[PDB]
């Protein structure tokens, strides 16, 4: 009865089902967990919001078309305005979190296409001016739930002030490495003939036990069309990709007044 | 060494000291606690925010003068915009909380005056129109941290629409009972010659295990000058009264989108 | 509904409600659907991003035809009243496309689902009363 | 022939019954019967369905 294709995930008051999964990835073979006393750093009693924040949040959907070059998000950035997770994140100097990432994309037995879904620790991307290096604005680096898109062309700005965004060049993974090697990162593939979802469970990954969530994204989430969407009756058809992410084992330290980041 | 006058209270990242206390009251002899399984009602796993929300929040101070008739606040209303407590309160349909209430008022050995500090369950107050009964607007009933003041005169409005506020008449405790009997409620007195603070620890009190915090205030906090402030060198002097309150054993159920109450 | 009819012989109810949905499109139709229950006291959800903050399930259409969403018992009072009543309001149930329904060619592009309701084993009722659903002329 | 039984609890515990009549039809209400088997209506299926398993396999 039980199948690698059929799965239920419940976190807090939220449940996901899928009937065409392909197993699930646990990044680096490690389930998330709370921070042990023998690895702890800040000494204040932490806030552990549990079910209020450790639950599935569904981002705005994006549209996959035959011309799409791909999508990226950063974490915890993508969830910064998500319910109580966002509130706990911004009321504290420090936070850590694992995640269940569930990417959703159904079609039909007559559609074809394949998405690579990658979770990338420290997903540092190139800037879009050659007058400077490492020259990206906070606002452009942290788009929130809307994320960003890849392009298949690199056109750096004439003036430094106009190029303070990522040069998200698809085949270089936006960072000067070949995209074909992205499989060294925890990943699944949504190949429409086989599956309609990808599930990745991510532990906290950093060189520290806990860090400033508003300064630092621990993971990038990359969705790249490896094989383009095609549908014979209408080559210009679009199918949604929906990203749903639950924080897990969240823990926060250094409570004060709320952080309100710059918006321009 | 140890004294009924000297006390430290620590909750979360916050500590209060006093060197001129007068013991402390535990309302009805009962310390607050979490909700037991054998008395529970909503079945979802509750959020228990612990140190993020169970900590001392200091309200705007008020000024005690020889002409002051008194002050009132409601709880949890007074704390509705206080840090993570406010966020947890408004993101959930249901909440319960106990409190440590610490009222602060110092002067000198040459000042005199006495404040009655009362914690009143279900502190229902009279409205200010005789064209209607029980006719109080949500906005006027829920002033937040600014609270309200008592008056020594009752002047109900000519028109019903103008009287939708409390008739907070001091000697009738704003509710048709004699103020001299308010001592049946958990209380302390700040008598300036004796003490400079009052401390009341309040359990959750209601006819239900848990309730809608945004609809219903469980406690009123009343501060009445029983003996007027007097100071011989300047009878028009003012001394501050500062109210600091910590939620305790907070527990919330029924998570959804955030409640944003009407403001007019 | 059968549950509604029984409830109208009682004054008080308590417990969890089960909503089961049966997709009746073609086998070739796929889709993901979000089903949500938002306990009361906040803005009623009219968008998926508000609905998904409440209790919810993401239903993947497939061989298993039906999906069950629960409205778990989440109430201030121990019983709610079997009448329209602000004090014992129960909250909001909504539904959104999580992705979309997708079909290949030669397939109907519009279709239906059926929604069922039933009480859970934690459910009970009190205080027998006459119903407003039957009457006669005198 | 007095029957002593538990009362239904109130706000804050036994009662006594004696039957006065020779016909059981004369008796007061039957005692509370909490019997139930919803599955004869909610799940009248020939082959057992385990919730956690697929309904159709």
């Amino acid at each position: 009865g039980y199948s690698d294709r059929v799965r239920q995930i419940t976190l807090g008051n939220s449940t996901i089902t899928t009937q065409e999964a392909a197993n699930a990835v646990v990044a680096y073979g490690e389930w998330p967990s709370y921070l042990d006393d023998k690895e702890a750093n800040p000494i204040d009693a932490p806030t552990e919001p549990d079910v209020s924040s450790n639950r599935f949040y569904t981002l705005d959907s994006v549209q996959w078309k035959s011309t799409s070059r791909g999508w990226w998000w950063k974490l915890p950035d993508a969830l910064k305005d998500m319910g109580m997770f966002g509130q706990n994140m911004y009321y504290h100097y420090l936070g850590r979190s694992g995640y269940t990432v569930h990417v959703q994309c159904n079609a039909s037995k007559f559609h074809q296409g394949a998405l690579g879904v990658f979770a990338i620790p420290e997903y540092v991307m190139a800037c879009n001016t050659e007058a400077k290096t490492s020259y990206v604005s906070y606002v452009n680096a942290n788009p929130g739930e809307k994320g960003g898109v890849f392009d298949n062309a690199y056109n750096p700005s004439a003036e430094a002030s106009e190029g303070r965004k990522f040069a998200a060049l698809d085949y270089l993974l936006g960072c000067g490495v070949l995209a074909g090697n992205a499989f060294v990162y925890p990943h699944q593939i949504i190949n429409l003939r086989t599956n309609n979802s990808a599930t990745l469970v991510l532990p906290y990954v950093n060189s520290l036990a806990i860090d400033c969530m508003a300064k630092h994204n621990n993971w990038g989430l990359v969705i790249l069309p490896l094989c383009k969407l095609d549908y014979a009756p209408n080559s210009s058809t679009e199918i949604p990709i929906t990203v749903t992410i639950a924080p897990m084992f969240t823990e926060f330290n250094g409570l004060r007044n709320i952080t309100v980041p710059a918006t321009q | 060494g140890y004294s009924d006058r000297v006390r430290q209270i620590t909750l979360g990242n916050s500590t209060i000291t006093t060197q001129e206390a007068a013991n402390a009251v535990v309302a009805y002899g009962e310390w607050p606690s979490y909700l037991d399984d054998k008395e529970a009602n909503p079945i979802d796993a509750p959020t228990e925010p612990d140190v993020s929300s169970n900590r001392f929040y200091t309200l705007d101070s008020v000024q005690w003068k020889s002409t002051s008739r008194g002050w009132w606040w409601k709880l949890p209303d007074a704390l509705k915009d206080m840090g993570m407590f406010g966020q947890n309160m408004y993101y959930h349909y249901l909440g319960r909380s106990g409190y440590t209430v610490h009222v602060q008022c110092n002067a000198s050995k040459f000042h005199q005056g006495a404040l009655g500090v009362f914690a009143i369950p279900e502190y229902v107050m009279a409205c200010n129109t005789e064209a209607k009964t029980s006719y109080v607007s949500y906005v006027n009933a829920n002033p937040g941290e600014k609270g309200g003041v008592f008056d020594n005169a009752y002047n109900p409005s000519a028109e019903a629409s103008e009287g939708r506020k409390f008739a907070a008449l001091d000697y009738l405790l704003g509710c048709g009972v004699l103020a001299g009997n308010a001592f049946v409620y958990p209380h302390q007195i700040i008598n300036l010659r004796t003490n400079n603070s009052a401390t009341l620890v309040l359990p959750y009190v209601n006819s239900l295990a848990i309730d809608c915090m945004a609809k219903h205030n469980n406690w009123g906090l009343v501060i009445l000058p029983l003996c007027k402030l007097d100071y011989a060198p300047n009878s028009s002097t003012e001394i501050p009264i500062t109210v600091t309150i910590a939620p305790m054993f907070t527990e919330f159920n029924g998570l959804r989108n955030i409640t944003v109450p009407a403001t007019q | 509904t059968m549950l509604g009819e029984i409830l109208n012989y009682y004054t008080h109810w308590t417990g969890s409600l089960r909503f089961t949905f049966l997709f009746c499109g073609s086998m070739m139709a796929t889709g993901k659907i979000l089903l949500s229950y938002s306990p009361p006291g906040a803005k009623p959800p009219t968008t998926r991003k508000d609905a998904m903050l409440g209790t919810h399930i993401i239903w993947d259409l497939g061989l298993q035809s039906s999906c069950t969403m629960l409205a778990p018992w989440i109430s201030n009072t121990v019983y709610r009243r079997c009448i329209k009543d602000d004090f014992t309001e129960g909250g909001y149930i909504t539904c959104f496309y999580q992705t979309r329904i997708v079909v290949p060619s030669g397939t109907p592009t519009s279709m239906f689902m059926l929604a069922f309701v039933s009480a859970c084993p934690d459910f009970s009722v009190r205080l027998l009363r006459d119903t407003n659903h039957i009457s006669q002329r005198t | 022939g007095a029957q002593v039984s538990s009362q239904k609890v109130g706000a804050h515990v036994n009662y006594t019954t004696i039957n006065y009549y020779k016909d059981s039809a004369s008796n007061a209400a039957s005692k509370l019967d909490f019997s139930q088997d919803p599955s004869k209506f909610t799940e009248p299926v020939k082959d057992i369905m385990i919730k956690t398993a697929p309904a159709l396999n």
């Binding site: 039980y2 699930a24 | 079945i43 | 084993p121 | 919730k51």
Partner: peptide, 27 residues
């Protein structure tokens, strides 16, 4: 005899899928 009490449970990530069924069965 009482109505059903609710057990303490957390979350799952599992091939057990009690949220899905098939009411075609008559259940």
């Amino acid at each position: 005899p009482t109505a059903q009490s609710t057990p303490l449970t957390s979350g799952v990530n599992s091939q057990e899928v009690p949220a899905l069924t098939a009411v075609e069965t008559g259940a």
